[PDB]
Amino acid sequence: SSIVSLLGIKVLNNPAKFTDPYEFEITFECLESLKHDLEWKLTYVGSSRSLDHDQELDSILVGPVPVGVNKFVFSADPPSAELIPASELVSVTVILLSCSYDGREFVRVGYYVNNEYDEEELRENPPAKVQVDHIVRNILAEKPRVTRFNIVWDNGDLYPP
Amino acid sequence: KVLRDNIQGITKPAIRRLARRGGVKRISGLIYEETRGVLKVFLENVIRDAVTYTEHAKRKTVTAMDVVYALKRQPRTLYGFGG
Amino acid sequence: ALIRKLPFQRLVREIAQDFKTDLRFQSSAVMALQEASEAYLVALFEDTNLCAIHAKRVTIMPKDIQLARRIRGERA
């Protein structure tokens, strides 16, 4: 059972420009001293057809972990458009916030993110040349999908990984 | 490619019922083969575990309690924080 | 309830036949798998639908299922 549990995430700047940074306030609880590091990662899903287009946006490595309620704000740089398959750039995708203990992932938070041109005429008639500066993004901040994984913290599975 | 590869465990009307159950209103025709591939990965994961448990217990057949335990090893996805 | 038992049961046997030859399932074991599979697909379709709605579409596409799997944090 989890020594570290995530208590909340706030998406601070939303909706936003495609090229705006992602601002999050993350709140978590650490119940007892841990020997190793926590690592929070933010991944942007570049293509739904494969993991090969994932872009890691940021990574916050914390060690040692302070015991008790921890609250922190960070700002992550946006994905770069050039790396995203053209036909998927201006459509819905997913971003993932995960956390790991000693490199073992124990929680993952997903949000849907829609991308849309900011003006009528472009929406109805998108250009062959993607105009990144007119893309607005909208994170479905009210609907986090949170998935936990059991891991070993600092320690009797009869069928271990 | 060959017949064994194309054996399926869920019909098209069944996929349409499940999608309606999930609040879906309209689907592309490509949803059928996508849903089937997803069901297959799920089943492979659970059955691999269930069978492992069965073999270590030397049982003749896979029992409900091997499957029930295998299902507990699947991650659960919740709708907010704390649960 | 939502899906027929015999096609499903045959698929389970075909997958089992990769991990272990002529290992059979008890009918209550198959039933538990069948119920879990339905609940799994229903939940997947809910996220798939949510994806479509957030994209401002009414028709779910393969990409909506692919993304719903990412956002459910399935470890590919």
Residue numbers in the entry:
A (entry chain A): 1 to 155, 159 to 164
B (entry chain C): 20 to 102
C (entry chain B): 60 to 135
Quote the passages of the study that discuss this structure, keeping the authors' original sentences:
To restrict the conformational flexibility of the H4 C-terminal tail, we replaced G94 with either a proline, which is predicted to favor the more extended structure of the H4 C-terminus seen when H4 binds to Asf1, or an alanine, which is slightly more conformationally constrained than glycine and expected to have a smaller effect on C-terminal tail flexibility. Comparisons of the Asf1-H3/H4 and Asf1-H3/H4G94P structures revealed both local and global effects conferred by the proline substitution. The RMSD between the Asf1-H3/H4 to the Asf1-H3/H4 G94P structures for all of the protein backbone atoms is 1.06 Å. The Asf1 C-terminal tail is shifted toward H4 and has a large RMSD of 1.58 Å, when compared to the WT complex. Overall, histone H4 has an RMSD of 0.46 Å, but the RMSD of the C-terminal tail alone (H4 92 to 101) is 1.35 Å, whereas the core of the protein excluding the tail has an RMSD of 0.29 Å. Close inspection of the site of the G94P substitution shows an unraveling of the last turn of the third α helix of H4 and a reorientation of Arg92. In the Asf1-H3/H4G94P complex, Arg92 rotates nearly 70 degrees and 8 Å to interact with residues Asp160 and Asp162 of the Asf1 C terminal tail. This increases the distance between the globular core of Asf1 and the histones, while at the same time bringing the Asf1 C-terminus toward H4. Thus, the overall structure of the Asf1-H3/H4G94P complex differs from the WT complex, and this is largely due to the changes in the H4 C-terminus from the inability of the proline to adopt the same conformation as Gly94 of H4.
The protein anti-silencing function 1 (Asf1) chaperones histones H3/H4 for assembly into nucleosomes every cell cycle as well as during DNA transcription and repair. The histone chaperone, anti-silencing function 1 (Asf1), is highly conserved throughout eukaryotes and binds to a heterodimer of H3/H4. Crystal structures of Asf1 bound to the H3/H4 dimer show that Asf1 binds to H3 at the H3/H4 dimerization surface, physically blocking formation of the H3/H4 tetramer. In the Asf1-H3/H4 complex, the C terminus of H4 forms an antiparallel β sheet with the globular core of Asf1.
